[PDB]
Design an enzyme around this catalytic site. Sequence first.
Site, PDB file in Angstrom:
ATOM      1  N   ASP D  37       8.428  10.837  -3.195  1.00 56.10           N
ATOM      2  CA  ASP D  37       8.003   9.488  -3.532  1.00 56.10           C
ATOM      3  C   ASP D  37       9.105   8.508  -3.171  1.00 56.10           C
ATOM      4  OD1 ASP D  37       6.649   7.252  -4.429  1.00 56.10           O
ATOM      5  OD2 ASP D  37       6.648   7.818  -6.538  1.00 56.10           O
ATOM      6  N   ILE D  56       8.705   8.054 -16.996  1.00 55.46           N
ATOM      7  CA  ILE D  56       9.233   9.239 -17.658  1.00 55.46           C
ATOM      8  C   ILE D  56      10.553   8.919 -18.352  1.00 55.46           C
ATOM      9  CG2 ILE D  56       8.022  10.879 -16.204  1.00 55.46           C
ATOM     10  CD1 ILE D  56      10.636  11.176 -14.630  1.00 55.46           C
TER      11      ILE D  56
END
Lengths: 234, 138, 700, 107, 282, 46
Positions: D37, D56
């Site tokens: 990513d 996260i």
Amino acid sequence: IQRKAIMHHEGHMDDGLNLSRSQHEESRTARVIRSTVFLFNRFIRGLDALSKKAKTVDLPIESVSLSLQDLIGYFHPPDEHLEHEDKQNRLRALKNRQNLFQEEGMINLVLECIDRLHVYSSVAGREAGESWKSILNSLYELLAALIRGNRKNCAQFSGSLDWLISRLERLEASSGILEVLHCVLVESPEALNIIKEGHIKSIISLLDKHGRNHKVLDVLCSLCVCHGVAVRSN
Amino acid sequence: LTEEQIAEFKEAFSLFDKDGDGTITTKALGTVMRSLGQNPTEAELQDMINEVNGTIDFPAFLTMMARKMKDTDSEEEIREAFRVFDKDGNGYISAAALRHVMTNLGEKLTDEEVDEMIREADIDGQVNYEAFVQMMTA
Amino acid sequence: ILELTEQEELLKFHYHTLRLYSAVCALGNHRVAHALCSHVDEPQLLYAIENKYMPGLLRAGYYDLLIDIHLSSYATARLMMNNEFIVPMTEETKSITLFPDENKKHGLPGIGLSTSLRPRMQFSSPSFVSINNECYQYSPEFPLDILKAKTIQMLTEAVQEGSLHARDPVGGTTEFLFVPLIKLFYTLLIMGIFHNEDLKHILQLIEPSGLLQMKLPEPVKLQMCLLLQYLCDCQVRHRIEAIVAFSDDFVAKLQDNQRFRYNEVMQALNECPCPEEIRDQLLDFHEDLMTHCGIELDLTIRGRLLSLVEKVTYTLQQLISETMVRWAQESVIEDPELVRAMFVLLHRQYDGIGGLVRALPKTYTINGVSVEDTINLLASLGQIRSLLSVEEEKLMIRGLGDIMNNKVFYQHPNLMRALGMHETVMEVMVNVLGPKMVANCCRFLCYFCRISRQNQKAMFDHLSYLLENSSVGLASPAMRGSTPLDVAAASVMDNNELALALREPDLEKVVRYLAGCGLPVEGERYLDFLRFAVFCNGESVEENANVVVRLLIRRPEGLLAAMEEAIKIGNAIMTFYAALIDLLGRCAPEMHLIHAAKGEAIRIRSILRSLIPLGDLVGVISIAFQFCPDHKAAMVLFLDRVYVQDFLLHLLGFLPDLRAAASLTDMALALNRYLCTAVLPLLAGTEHHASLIDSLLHTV
Amino acid sequence: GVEIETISPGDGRTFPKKGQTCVVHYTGMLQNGKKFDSSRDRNKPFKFRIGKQEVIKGFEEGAAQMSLGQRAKLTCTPDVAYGATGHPGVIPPNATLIFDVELLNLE
Amino acid sequence: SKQRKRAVVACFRMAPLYNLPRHRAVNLFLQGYEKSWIETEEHYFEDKLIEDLAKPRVDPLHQLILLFSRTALTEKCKLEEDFLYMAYADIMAKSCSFEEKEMEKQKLLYQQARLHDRGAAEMVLQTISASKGETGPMVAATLKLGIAILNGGNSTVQQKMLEYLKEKKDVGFFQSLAGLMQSCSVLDLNAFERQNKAEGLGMKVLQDDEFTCDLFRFLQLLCEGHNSDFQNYLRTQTGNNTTVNIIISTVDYLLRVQESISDFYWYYSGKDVIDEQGQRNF
Amino acid sequence: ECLTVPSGEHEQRRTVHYEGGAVSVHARSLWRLETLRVAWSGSHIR
């Protein structure tokens, strides 16, 4: 109706047996059926002799491989250079032959022939059983021949998919099983609804053993998409 | 049927609905009808609930409300339909004009139907239309 | 990658990897599409756009991955709504003028008026954080104008280089040069991008009025054929938006005209105005407008339509008519798909009238208030039409429940059958059968059948199929509004016409399915359906009735005492014989019998005398004082039709009804029930008068 | 748990507060260097809210540590990642994450 | 009757003349305009088109005919609808003083010559043989074209079809003809009764009639000019495998229509003043 | 209806039956004629 036939001194009014003639290729295929069964039961009995006890006790080999190459040639799909009308004539004759072998159940006979064959790794005097690899390869190629047109025969066949995925990892003749499985999974979405998780994990595992096969990716692509639709869970 | 009446009925039913799957209570029928300006008696509310389970569904509600609306609409339409003719204000129909206007568009069948009207209409010939209404509507 | 161009095993394998990546995300798996967006590395595809030295294999593979990840869903979403033509009614819609300012040419169909609905998209961001229903979101996102400008540059490049017949071109073949590029441009054209500024540029590239006059292989011109067909469809879209823009002006004139004419005839004091009263009294506005439009066929306003019909006669058509024929001449064609796509456009260029005939019974006008509900409903309908081609049932039920809650679903009930969405629902139901999914689908169709009258005709056109799956309806409290048999029962109730319109082999299927009930509970549902199949207005037909009674005299299947055996033993046989006696009570009326002997009506009525020979009266007295409210009314209706005043008074009672005036409580179900059932005996007497006065004081 | 090496600082001290939308350009890869990513790569400043708690947790601990214009490596524990299962489709089970995060602006 | 009375009540009920809020009227105007106006004449273009295809390498028309020939030769067990075919069958089939009879013989024969050079008989002959007994609009379009080819009774097309069915020996064509003639229609007994009572109450019978008038006109136009070989071939059918004596079948269809005309007689044997519907059906 | 012999996987197919429907076109509804004479075995049938 299972109207049982017996002889009688008189009979009834309804013993009016009518007549209708066959065709030439039908007679041809039927005589092929009798010759084929009559060979393969000899072959199976020879394997039952040389399996349990070690004898010499003899077994048909080279006539079997010769007849097997003959039947490979006999279901040969017609070419790319034929008249379209004649292409479809010969294709019609091909499907009629496939269906007439389907109903008599030669496929399960060939399958159990594989079962009795698929034992050792080169039992018998292995001078005679030297062509074992070739015989199994031709049997897988014949098994690929008897399906590729008929939707109904492969969808009927689709019950025995589990044995094939079990034998997927033999590392010896697996390309034949993979080709058979591919040609089955193209033409029947009945088979696609059958197959499950560990089968797919086994297929990915076989990819994880035998390098990088483009055939495997064709199999996964075929399993992904039906004739027009897709299955999400797979 | 008119459009914003359907819109208002839908909005009122969903307004007094909470979950949104065509499930309101039976006792909220009186509340949703009095929000819609409707207030019959208690036994008529009970008869209309018994016409419908516990959860009042949407289309039959529209059908019963259509009955209650088209009642008064049918009275005003039989008013205005014979206010087309008869400009004086007595509701009285001459039988030659009945022979004229009975063969109107819609049905317009043969002399059987106009003889069927003329054989029994009461003709003094100026005929009151309510006899015609009682005749046709069984 | 550019060094892999001869490692042919590795080439072939990686080509099949791209084939598999394209194959996985087929039709809306956005959950898997975001994962591929992680794997596919978004600018690498943009780089593989322009790498003029890659092999054509991987060229086609990467353009197919681009389309399959980022484009396919909304492409299909407008592919479904190419043919719906619904349009609002604002002055923006009225602003359309059909023609380029009294010219003598066509519109050059890249015109951005576009007042139609044409549903629209959303996009998800493929960031890797916690879930926001992002895997189940609209779709992964992608740049737009970068693609637009660079594909225009690719097009002008490929034209002004390949037309010179380079022996190079990128993928060896010109096929590998043009085919994925044209495919990408075709998919991107449909998605509403390439507005007028670049429409003019691309139509300078292709029109000049060039691209199409090159020399080509086969699938290149196949793609070009699809491009040209989409241009024809844009012509149709513009045409119908224009004709709605005309009708908005035209109709109000007719409205004011005939209301003004009514007030003219009303205002006068002068029989002969009674045919004008007749003309103002059609069955609905349908025959009104039928007379109003057919009168202009053989008011000065009629001259405007006389103009406008010739205004909507309609040179792209004529160049198509050249070049399709030319392609067929010079370049003798294999690939029968290309031949089909050839002649479809060829016929369509002449059948513009007939294509317009095909088009106009789908277009539709909508007020400006209800716009968002139309968009939302149409989006959900496109969702379920996408789900047609595959967990899934929960998505289906969510979509149906969204459909159940719309104003326009009731404000425009013509539009639903105009979409044909009922046929879509039924096809889904066909796809299920060989779960509660069917229980929702039957519920939606039964919910759908009653919303007008002529809806029920279109629902009735499937009853041949619909009876064939009757064995699904079984023992379940989710049966009313759940059986396909109940959908067939929804297809009858109102119409006397359609009750006539069905035929006997349907009833043959029904009685074959009913003959198997030689034991059940399931027979009463068949008998409920037949009760809907015979009676239908409050007054029965005879034509169904004769056939029903004849097939029951084949096999009805001591039956009077059998009901009177097992009361106290579980309502199944009880309500079964209730339904069987309710069905037979719907034959042999009096208007064709008591008025005059009609022959066979006597003999059917004699057959009805032949069964249950007035031992029904045991059931009449035995029920009424214990099952209690229901069965007795069916027995009454059997007696009321087939079967003086001494035998009337023989039958006697309402005393148990009056005996529970405040203590109740299924006893509270016979209360008003026999205030319409004990009224049929209008056509010990002092004792009954006392009991009736007791009920009257109970209702005082 | 996170092992933050400041690659390039901003001012070091202007770390954010709750209720503020955090502007990043992260390009995260695996332990094994596999890039998966990159919010750089689609040319889009990814944005999120501390306290809303969408990102996260190790990324959230780095969200209050970096400053105005600070670039840092947010090496996180696979416990603090998607987990022992991992992300269904992208992240393998228990992949130790190695990032490159550049916090830019606040609101 | 009953529901007519509520229908008259409903005829009084439609007092909303032009309240018609703003767009219901526009919608219904769209309906009526599409229904009544667009049925027009553009249909000169068929002569222009079938001229314009035969401009030569093989003709585009010959590609099209050969396309449908190969599509017909595929095996499907059930035919499709294929509105391509349904368009072009009609497009071709719309292209057909003693001096004036001289001229109108020759123009017609030239227009048939435009087609039956291009194997045009055999596509129609095969597509009949495809559907086995199915009576779709497919078969109606094929029979319209097959009539419009054999309209004058070309002996070359008759010989063309006989050479075809002698070489590529097929029983499925004659089996298809027998399967067609098996149903085709009868007149009626009861659907008129139900039709009449539904007609009276609410305010077809021979919905498969013009198909039969085309099928038998087609069979007429296979023996125009006394092809005595082809007249014998229908009866006894030697070169194929199993014969189908088609003439006894058409006798049996005539017997069916005879009986149903006779049953229509008895229904009007007493009332003696026949309705418009009875005459129109009869 | 045609004369038949029962299907695959049986008796070893020694019983005789009748069967209507599609077994007639199929394989095991087939019988070969033989006569006595060696010569002119392929003659006509009287």
